[PDB]
Write a protein that binds this ligand. Structure first.
Ligand SMILES: CCCCCCCCCCCCCCCCCC(=O)OC[C@H](CO[C@@H]1O[C@H](CO[C@H]2O[C@H](CO)[C@H](O)[C@H](O)[C@H]2O)[C@H](O)[C@H](O)[C@H]1O)OC(=O)CCCCCCCCCCCCCCCCC
Ligand code: CLA
Ligand code: CLA
Ligand code: CLA
Ligand code: CLA
Ligand code: CLA
Ligand SMILES: CC1=C(/C=C/C(C)=C/C=C/C(C)=C/C=C/C=C(C)/C=C/C=C(C)/C=C/C2=C(C)CCCC2(C)C)C(C)(C)CCC1
Ligand SMILES: CC1=C(/C=C/C(C)=C/C=C/C(C)=C/C=C/C=C(C)/C=C/C=C(C)/C=C/C2=C(C)CCCC2(C)C)C(C)(C)CCC1
Ligand SMILES: CC1=C(/C=C/C(C)=C/C=C/C(C)=C/C=C/C=C(C)/C=C/C=C(C)/C=C/C2=C(C)CCCC2(C)C)C(C)(C)CCC1
Ligand SMILES: CC1=C(/C=C/C(C)=C/C=C/C(C)=C/C=C/C=C(C)/C=C/C=C(C)/C=C/C2=C(C)CCCC2(C)C)C(C)(C)CCC1
Ligand SMILES: CCCCCCCCCCCCO[C@@H]1O[C@H](CO)[C@@H](O[C@H]2O[C@H](CO)[C@@H](O)[C@H](O)[C@H]2O)[C@H](O)[C@H]1O
Ligand SMILES: CCCCCCCS[C@@H]1O[C@H](CO)[C@@H](O)[C@H](O)[C@H]1O
Ligand SMILES: CCCCCCCS[C@@H]1O[C@H](CO)[C@@H](O)[C@H](O)[C@H]1O
Ligand code: OEX
Ligand SMILES: [Cl-]
Ligand SMILES: [Cl-]
Ligand SMILES: [Fe+2]
Ligand SMILES: [Mg+2]
Lengths: 81, 37, 35, 36, 342, 29, 62, 334, 451
């Protein structure tokens, strides 16, 4: 009883569904593509299944330098290619 | 496996055991239809 | 040990019999409303 | 003001939840995270 | 009203679906970011560079195993700000360095402050006493002791809890093997206030539901109540007699009863927080010295206390090399403690 | 999994279909 | 007998799905109780016959 | 009336300071027996060969324990699930070495506590009350049965029952983790939700009622004096409490119905704790927590550890050390 | 909508089925429709298990619970539990699935279309819960049905091909039972056995002659008792002891099913006669003993003298005494020395495990079975990773014994809860205070103070 339109009015109204039968699927597909294009990996810096280890590399690319950890990760990443 | 003559029905057979669960969920659809009165 | 066992057997039988006969002694009636 | 009955919205919505969570369970057995 | 401050106050305090308030300015963005940071990291972000672990749905983890993990031990207690000296504004690197950890921990800490300021602000507007805010100091003491003080006493944030289901399980087991935290009497008082609170929650709900007055004809009894009614919905007199005769004692004062329900779990959480402040310094209840002196001299003396330290020693040796990768532990097979066969 | 998915699709719609038909027809729900 | 068997089984399957919807709808429907009662009876005798047909043809196909 | 009739009248009297009742006729002697045996063993019992390997563990105060380390120690693994009453032993000295007191205590305690639960039904009926307080107590009772009876049955030995002692309890927890990965079991997770949520809703309810008590006292007096035992009027304003809590979160997230509120208070912890109990009682038959050990594998087949694998390493430490002289063969199968 | 809201019925939607208590027609509908769900699952689940079934892998490596039930009756299987013909599994699955449509038909008809009450319509089918005579009469019909069911089992065992017998001399096989145990001293002697270790109450039944003979007794007892209840009305002491109401009778049945649930749990966990290990996997005690057997065999092959090998504790590493002197396997499995199974019994003499038989007579089939059972111990994760809790992923296994014990313990427990719920509600409603305390007739206000 605070004023706003009741939720159950909104979600049973034809108009709500006209808008959302497009916005909901569009958002879902955009999330899908953020992954399927590979873009998610590059934004967040997450390894692909082929990028955790170089072919013969023994150990994990653990960050060991506070102020040059960024550079460490960068060097760790060329040492894959 | 099922005798080969019934093989075409394998996918259907895969889904049937779950139907009882559906009956429980159906009670709720029905109640929602009668406004849980 | 034999005496102890016989003693405990007697004790337990005694109490089980109270429980069973007790609950047989018009239990539903023993309430504050309809008897 | 309604036009689509609330019980239909709930049933479709509930079924949508089951599908997506089913998919997530499927994925525990296939691809990444499947142990295979 | 008056000036802009008072017009702002007006709008902030409108009676709406989600109340805002002045506290809302702190609460809303901090809570939103803490939660979104968690969902973002668990969905997309690795812990390969900080822990050598996969930690996101993107890498194949499930809801139990995803986490936003702590930064590497070499980060120390860096604030690890996006624009700080470590990430230097690179969002990708900041993610890979564990920047989402301090992001979530710090927005979360401000959000809890905002939440408790919310409880005070709404209490004051509605004209109730602020005991709910006061009870909420127990969640705050826990969050602050465990997520801030504990790692601040240790070598780095690396040893704070990571934000995830399995990650927290790991934190429990670490505290057992390294701190013998179950032995600690402040943890024991925590456990008593949690289980005793859950006990009081259950027993008070059941007692009210089972001493109800017949106030309707329905066999479903929930409709036979009105928020505005003058009268108690259940019989305190009958509930008192029942428990007096079942348990030997009973509440007789409803006000005392409800204050005690605040008291027990709130006090238990505060006690657990103090033990964790001690663990920040490794100031543990690890041992009983009299037990050790006896067991060192008498190889036939054994208690459950000596048995549990053997378990701790196994936990430390078996878990440390993978759990503490910056230590570069190599423990040759021959040194690992093991009993016979296993 | 297309065959099994189609089967569960029409088995699943049968329940709510019954409710829908009855509601439309003002049946004895 | 395979064509026969397989048709008889797909028919049983299909009639079952029809009965599964139609019996409860008929039973709770205000209107066409007369037209329904007859169809339910026919569907049923038919359902039973198909089961026995599948049962018998089973042995000429297994 | 006759003696029997008067006896029954006394046993079932609503007037006794402590209700007796028919459940009480069994409860009183069994609880007294368990309590007395427990107190005497906890003080004075000699060491008990819990794991059947002639390695006796000292539980009692006089034999070098304190309140935190002391326990009544479970009966010997050599016994297994065999019934070991005092009269099955050649002497009290043998009975003591083999952990006879543990069986005596736990069997009397379980019977007595089950009767405590019956007695709660019984009195509620004598008082014209609704009957389900006893259903709330079934949750802790189920949990006691799980750790003292169901688990030992599943594993084939009371030596794997929870010890009657503070450190013993933690021993049971840690070994249970190694053997079942309980933390990763959803029923234990529901138990955590049950007890953490019970604590939470306990504090919440206490604080909401306390916050809306009606002014009936002066600043010098405890507000508790503003309530008088047996008064008819409710002592706080629920509409005020709902007004507060509905705004803290949102209106429909708050109860304004006290009956629904108190039902929720009962239900949440009782259900969660029933799942806790069923977690222990089904891990009794070795249906264990989720196992995601090596679940994440890279493109070559390297294992990419997750927090699950780090759990596994801690579990391995517990497993290889526990009962360090009791295993001769490579698998711990019970 | 007769009684189909809270206002009319007094019951909210979430207690909606309580609206049925006095509507015998719709309630009969609910019951028959429900029986259709049970028969449905039995048929659909069997077909599913069959569709998935690879006949050469053990059943217990395949997540099967129903095929093993069918095989134990002696259908489909040969020596050693070898599957010789899946057709019987097919028949069982199909016949239940077809049958459930009929039951489902009856349920939907009664529930939705038939007379909502039966009393006006028929006095044979109508009933009043408070009619003690009609109640014991319906109870008697059901007793006769159950008695006939038990005798069907006897008929299978004796006249229609026998039962699978894990104990068959020369090796597990289907065997016709010709000499079923009739002696009441043996049959009822099981009921008075201790449920503790080495005794096991009825769970100890270890031969098919006792199993068959017991169902002969039980079938006769149920039929006789059913006749009895058709011909009698409850005695006075019965009338005084019980609540007579639908909810009360539900509650008595809830308690009984709870008890039976617990019993079934222990049956599947310990018993390897009516749950043959060939089909259900080894029991926990069996797999633990099989491990000790495995390493005794191995190390003795390497030259160890297993009788004289003292382990680290001073107890024998392979062989030790039980607390009554019997020679038993050592290590932790000392707890499992009550275990008995066909692969082990050839090694047991009057004094327990026989060292000379051990040294000379262990056959390759015993080594194989002991290795199979050790490596199929009923331990595994909820996601079906077989092994101890620290095991790595690879082996997709949880024993049918664990699935069946755990599920039935959960069910039996919640059935105890429902018993207390309904037994206490039935008491309160019979005495008239199930809706709360009368504010003007509060009993405690008429009682003297405690102090
Ligand atoms: C109303 C009545 C109430 C009265 C209550 C008080 C009366 C006492 C009742 C006994 C209660 C517990 C006894 C211990 C149970 C146990 O160790 O049971 C195990 C036994 C089976 O015992 C095993 O039985 C075995 C039989 O197998 C033998 O025989 C087999 C034949 O194939 C195989 O060969 C096998 O290898 C071989 O070992 C062996 O003898 C084992 O050594 C032996 O341990 O089960 C059984 O007797 C089946 C019956 C037990 C059911 C379990 C009940 C659990 C209670 C749950 C309560 C929850 C409460 C919640 C409250 C809230
Ligand atoms: C009330 C809301 C609020 C609060 C309390 C915080 C608090 C915090 N944020 Mg968050 N944030 C918010 C909203 C908020 N944020 C919003 C809406 C977004 C989306 C844009 C973010 C996005 C965000 C990111 C991306 C990051 C943070 C970070 C932080 C932390 C460091 C902030 C800092 O050092 O500021 C310093 C600035 C102030 C304290 C402002 C002071 C105002 C003074 C009084 C006047 C200044 C005038 C000045 C003289 C003129 C200009 C300066 C000139 C000399 C050049 C801290 C926990 C960092 C963190 O979590 O790292 C782990 C981080 O990387 N926030
Ligand atoms: C085993 C599950 C089960 C069964 C057998 C029943 C049985 C019944 N219930 Mg209960 N109920 C259940 C679970 C069940 N209920 C659950 C889980 C809830 C909580 C959601 C309820 C809540 C509830 C309420 C609140 C009420 C009932 C009522 C009833 C009765 C009247 C139904 C009616 O009016 O339908 C009207 C519905 C329809 C016309 C829709 C179609 C219904 C049919 C049966 C669908 C059949 C589908 C099936 C696939 C067809 C196969 C056909 C084939 C064999 C030919 C009926 C005997 C009512 C009552 O007691 O009346 C006196 C009542 O008010 N139930
Ligand atoms: C006695 C009951 C029972 C038992 C012992 C089993 C046992 C098994 N099933 Mg079968 N099944 C059952 C009933 C049962 N099922 C039912 C009712 C259905 C219809 C849904 C099926 C349909 C089915 C299929 C389709 C499959 C199995 C399979 C299996 C195997 C693997 C199970 C698994 O992975 O679980 C995973 C565990 C879960 C999903 C967790 C269940 C936990 C529930 C939700 C908690 C219950 C709590 C309680 C009842 C609620 C009370 C609430 C409270 C407030 C009162 C195993 C042998 C698999 C197999 O290997 O086939 C060869 C398989 O593919 N089952
Ligand atoms: C326990 C289950 C049960 C019970 C007690 C009843 C009782 C009743 N039924 Mg319902 N019904 C059921 C199940 C049941 N039915 C099933 C499964 C179906 C689908 C086939 C139906 C379909 C149905 C219809 C369509 C009608 C009834 C009617 C009736 C009434 C008259 C019956 C009569 O007079 O027959 C007298 C006796 C006979 C006709 C001979 C019975 C022959 C049986 C089948 C022999 C088999 C015996 C054996 C023990 C079966 C074991 C089954 C088990 C393995 C599952 C009566 C109230 C009528 C009614 O409601 O009138 C308004 C009505 O029109 N029934
Ligand atoms: C589902 C099966 C079933 C049910 C629900 C009933 C129900 C009833 N029976 Mg009937 N009965 C049955 C099957 C059944 N009977 C069979 C198969 C027979 C033939 C043997 C009988 C022969 C029979 C007779 C001869 C009598 C009844 C009577 C009664 C009534 C009260 C019985 C009572 O108080 O028991 C409660 C049990 C007691 C009071 C005995 C003492 C309690 C002891 C201590 C319990 C010990 C058991 C314990 C839990 C251990 C479990 C295992 C143990 C065997 C080792 C009630 C209407 C009575 C009657 O009124 O007839 C009209 C009566 O005289 N029945
Ligand atoms: C970090 C960061 C940030 C932020 C971000 C954000 C804010 C985000 C958000 C995000 C979000 C906001 C997300 C979300 C998501 C969600 C999800 C993912 C969900 C899911 C769900 C589910 C899955 C469900 C489940 C369930 C349950 C729960 C119960 C019932 C049943 C079921 C199972 C259904 C920024 C930019 C500032 C900056 C830097 C960094
Ligand atoms: C055998 C067989 C068969 C059979 C079938 C059947 C018998 C079926 C049934 C079916 C059914 C029986 C179905 C049902 C379904 C249901 C559903 C699908 C539901 C869902 C639900 C939901 C989703 C809910 C929701 C909600 C609501 C409503 C309200 C509250 C909230 C919620 C959200 C919970 C056939 C013919 C194929 C043929 C072949 C063989
Ligand atoms: C009352 C009521 C209810 C319930 C209902 C019910 C419970 C029903 C049941 C029903 C039923 C219980 C049904 C059944 C059906 C069945 C059917 C319909 C079957 C068919 C079959 C077939 C079609 C087969 C085929 C085949 C063959 C022959 C061979 C192999 C392959 C196959 C499988 C394909 C509810 C809850 C909703 C609520 C409301 C009221
Ligand atoms: C088949 C078989 C067999 C046999 C079996 C038999 C022969 C059985 C019997 C059984 C029986 C013969 C049982 C009985 C039971 C009983 C009961 C379970 C009872 C109950 C009771 C009651 C419950 C009561 C109650 C009460 C009281 C106590 C007090 C007062 C009140 C009243 C009434 C409530 C054998 C093992 C050889 C082998 C395998 C198979
Ligand atoms: C080991 C278990 C023992 C098995 C016993 C089997 C019991 C089956 C036979 C029941 C016979 C007992 O019958 C029952 O006895 C008690 C005790 O005398 C009677 O006597 C009682 O009557 C009234 C009833 O309100 C009570 O208030 C009163 O205290 C008591 O004298 C019951 O009214 C009678 O119905
Ligand atoms: C971010 C809010 C904290 C600052 C509060 C100081 C108020 S400052 C105050 O503001 C009035 C309007 O409200 C003016 O009318 C007045 O002239 C001015 O001095
Ligand atoms: C209700 C089920 C009706 C079908 C009964 C099938 C009989 S069963 C049949 O009997 C033969 C001996 O006659 C056995 O040799 C054979 O193993 C068995 O399959
Ligand atoms: O005892 Mn007590 O703990 Ca159950 O596992 Mn086996 O046994 Mn012993 O090892 Mn691990
Ligand atoms: Cl240990
Ligand atoms: Cl061993
Ligand atoms: Fe309260
Ligand atoms: Mg996947």
């Amino acid at each position: 009883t605070t004023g706003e339109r009741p939720f159950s009015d909104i979600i049973t109204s034809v108009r709500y569904w006209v808008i959302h039968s497009i916005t909901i699927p569009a958002l879902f597909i955009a999330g899908w593509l953020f992954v399927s294009t590979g873009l998610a990996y590059d934004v967040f810096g997450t390894p692909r299944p082929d990028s955790y280890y170089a072919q013969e590399q023994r150990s994990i690319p653990l960050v060991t330098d506070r102020f040059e950890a960024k550079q460490q990760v960068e060097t760790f990443l060329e040492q894959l290619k | 496996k099922l005798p080969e003559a019934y093989a075409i029905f394998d996918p259907l057979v895969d889904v049937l055991p779950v139907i009882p669960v559906l009956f429980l969920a159906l009670a709720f659809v029905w109640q929602a239809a009668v406004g849980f009165r | 040990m034999e005496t102890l066992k016989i003693t405990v057997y007697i004790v337990v039988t005694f109490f089980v019999l109270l429980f069973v006969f007790g609950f047989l002694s018009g239990d539903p009636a023993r309430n504050p409303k309809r008897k | 003001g309604g036009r689509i009955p609330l019980w239909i919205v709930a049933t479709v919505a509930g079924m949508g939840v089951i599908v997506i969570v089913g998919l997530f369970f499927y994925g525990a057995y296939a691809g990444l995270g499947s142990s295979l | 009203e008056r000036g802009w401050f008072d017009i702002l106050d007006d709008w902030l305090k409108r009676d709406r679906f989600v109340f805002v308030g002045w506290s809302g300015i702190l609460l809303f963005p901090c809570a939103y970011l803490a939660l979104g940071g968690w969902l973002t990291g668990t969905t997309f972000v690795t812990s390969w560079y900080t822990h050598g672990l996969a930690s996101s749905y993107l890498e194949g983890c499930n809801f139990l195993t995803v986490a936003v993990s702590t930064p590497a031990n070499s980060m120390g207690h860096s604030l690890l700000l996006l624009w700080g000296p470590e990430a230097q504004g690179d969002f990708t690197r900041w993610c890979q360095l564990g920047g989402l950890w301090t992001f979530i921990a710090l927005h979360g800490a401000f959000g809890l402050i905002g939440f408790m300021l919310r409880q005070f602000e709404i209490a004051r507007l509605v004209g109730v006493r602020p005991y709910n805010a006061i009870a909420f100091s127990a969640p705050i003491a826990v969050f602050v002791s465990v997520f801030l003080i504990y790692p601040l006493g240790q070598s780095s944030w690396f040893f704070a809890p990571s934000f995830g289901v399995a990650a927290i399980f790991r934190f429990l087991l670490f505290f057992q093997g390294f701190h013998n935290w179950t032995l600690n009497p402040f943890h024991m008082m925590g456990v008593a206030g949690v289980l005793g609170g859950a006990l009081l929650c259950a027993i008070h709900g059941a007692t009210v539901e089972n001493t109800l007055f017949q106030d309707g004809e329905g066999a479903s009894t929930f409709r036979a109540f009105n928020p505005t009614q003058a009268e108690e919905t259940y019989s305190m007199v009958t509930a008192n007699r029942f428990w007096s005769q079942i348990f030997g004692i009973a509440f007789s004062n409803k006000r005392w009863l409800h204050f005690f329900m605040l008291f027990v779990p709130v006090t238990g959480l505060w006690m657990s927080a103090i033990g964790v402040v001690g663990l920040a310094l490794n100031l543990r209840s690890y041992d009983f010295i009299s037990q050790e002196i006896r067991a060192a001299e008498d190889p036939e003396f054994e208690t459950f206390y000596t048995k549990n330290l053997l378990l701790n020693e196994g936990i430390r040796a078996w878990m440390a090399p993978q759990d503490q990768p910056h230590e570069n532990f190599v423990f040759p097979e021959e040194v690992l403690p093991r009993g016979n066969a296993l | 999994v297309i065959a099994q998915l189609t089967m569960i699709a029409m088995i699943g719609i049968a329940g709510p279909m019954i409710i829908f038909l009855l509601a439309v027809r003002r049946g004895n729900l | 007998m395979t064509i026969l068997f397989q048709l008889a089984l797909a028919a049983l399957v299909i009639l079952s799905f029809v009965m599964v919807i139609g019996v409860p709808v008929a039973y709770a429907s205000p209107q066409d109780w007369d037209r329904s009662k007859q169809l339910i009876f026919l569907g049923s005798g038919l359902w039973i016959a198909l089961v026995l047909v599948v049962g018998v043809l089973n042995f000429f196909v297994v | 009336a006759n003696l029997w009739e008067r006896f029954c009248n006394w046993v079932t009297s609503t007037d006794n300071r402590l209700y007796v009742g028919w459940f009480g006729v069994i409860m009183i002697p069994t609880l007294l027996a368990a309590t007395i045996c427990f107190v005497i063993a906890f003080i004075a019992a000699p060491p008990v060969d819990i794991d059947g390997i002639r390695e006796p563990v000292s539980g009692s105060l006089l034999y070098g324990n304190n309140i935190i380390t002391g326990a009544v120690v479970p009966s010997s693994n050599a016994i297994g699930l065999h019934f070991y009453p005092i009269w099955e032993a050649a002497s009290l000295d043998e009975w003591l070495y083999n952990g006879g007191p543990y069986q005596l205590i736990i069997f009397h305690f379980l019977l007595g506590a089950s009767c405590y639960m019956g007695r709660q039904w019984e009195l509620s009926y004598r008082l014209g009350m609704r009957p389900w307080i006893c259903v709330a107590y079934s949750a802790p009772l189920a949990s006691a049965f799980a750790v003292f009876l169901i688990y030992p049955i599943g594993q084939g030995s009371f030596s794997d029952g929870m010890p009657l002692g503070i450190s013993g309890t933690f021993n049971f927890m840690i070994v249970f983790q190694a053997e079942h990965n309980i933390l990763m079991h959803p029923f234990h997770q529901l138990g955590v939700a049950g007890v953490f949520g019970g604590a939470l809703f306990c504090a919440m309810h206490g604080s909401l009622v306390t916050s809306s008590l009606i002014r009936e006292t002066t600043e010098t007096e405890s507000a508790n004096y503003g309530y008088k035992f047996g008064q008819e009027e409710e002592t706080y304003n629920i509409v005020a409490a709902h007004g507060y809590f509905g705004r803290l979160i949102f209106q429909y997230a708050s109860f304004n119905n006290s009956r629904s509120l108190h039902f929720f208070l009962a239900a949440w912890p009782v259900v969660g704790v029933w799942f806790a109990a069923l977690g222990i009682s089904t891990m009794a038959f070795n249906l264990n927590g989720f196992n995601f050990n090596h679940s994440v594998i890279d493109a070559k087949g390297n294992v990419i550890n997750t927090w699950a694998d780090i759990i596994n390493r801690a579990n391995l430490g517990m497993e290889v050390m526990h009962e360090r002289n009791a295993h001769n063969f490579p698998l711990d199968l019970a | 909508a007769t009684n189909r809201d809270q206002e009319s019925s007094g019951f909210a939607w979430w207690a909606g089925n309580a609206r049925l208590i006095n509507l015998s027609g719709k309630l009969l509908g609910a019951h028959v429709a429900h029986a259709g769900l049970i028969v449905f699952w039995a048929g659909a689940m069997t077909l599913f298990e069959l569709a998935h079934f690879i006949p050469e892998k053990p059943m217990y490596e395949q997540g099967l619970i129903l095929i093993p039930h069918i095989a134990t009756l002696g259908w489909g299987v040969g020596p050693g539990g070898e599957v010789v013909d899946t057709f019987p599994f097919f028949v069982v699955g199909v016949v239940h699935l077809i049958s459930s449509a009929v039951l489902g038909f009856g349920g939907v008809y009664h529930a939705i279309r038939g007379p909502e009450t039966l009393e006006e319509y028929s006095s044979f089918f109508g009933y009043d819960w408070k009619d003690k005579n009609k109640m014991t009469t319906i109870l008697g019909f059901h007793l006769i049905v159950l008695g006939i069911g038990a005798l069907l089992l006897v008929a299978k065992a004796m006249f229609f091909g026998g039962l699978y017998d894990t104990w068959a001399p020369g090796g597990g096989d289907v065997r016709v039972i010709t000499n079923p145990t009739l002696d009441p001293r043996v049959i009822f002697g099981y009921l008075l056995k201790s449920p503790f270790g080495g005794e096991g109450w009825i769970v100890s039944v270890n031969n098919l002659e006792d199993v068959v003979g017991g169902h002969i007794w039980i079938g006769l007892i149920c039929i006789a008792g059913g006749i009895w209840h058709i011909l009698t009305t409850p005695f006075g002491w019965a009338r005084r002891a019980f609540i007579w109401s639908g909810e009360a009778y539900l509650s008595y049945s809830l308690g009984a099913l709870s008890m039976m649930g617990f019993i079934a749990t222990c049956f599947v966990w310990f018993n390897n006669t009516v749950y043959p290990s060939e089909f259900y996997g080894p029991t926990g005690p069996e797999a633990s003993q099989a491990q000790a057997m495995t390493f005794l065999i191995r190390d003795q092959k390497l030259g160890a003298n297993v009788g004289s090998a003292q382990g680290p504790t001073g107890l024998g590493k392979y062989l030790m005494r039980s607390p009554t002197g019997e020679i038993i396997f050592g290590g932790e499995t000392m707890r499992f020395w009550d275990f008995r199974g066909p692969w082990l019994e050839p090694l047991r003499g009057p004094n327990g495990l026989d060292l000379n038989k051990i040294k000379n007579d262990i056959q390759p089939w015993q080594e194989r079975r002991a290795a199979e059972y050790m490596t199929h111990a009923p331990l595994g994760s909820l996601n079906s990773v077989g092994g101890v809790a620290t095991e790595i992923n690879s082996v997709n296994f949880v024993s049918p014994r664990s699935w069946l014990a755990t599920s039935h313990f959960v069910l039996a427990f919640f059935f105890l809860v429902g018993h207390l719920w309904h037994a206490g509600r039935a008491r309160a409603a019979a005495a008239g205070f199930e809706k709360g305390i009368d504010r003007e007739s509060e009993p405690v206000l008429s009682m003297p103070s405690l102090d």
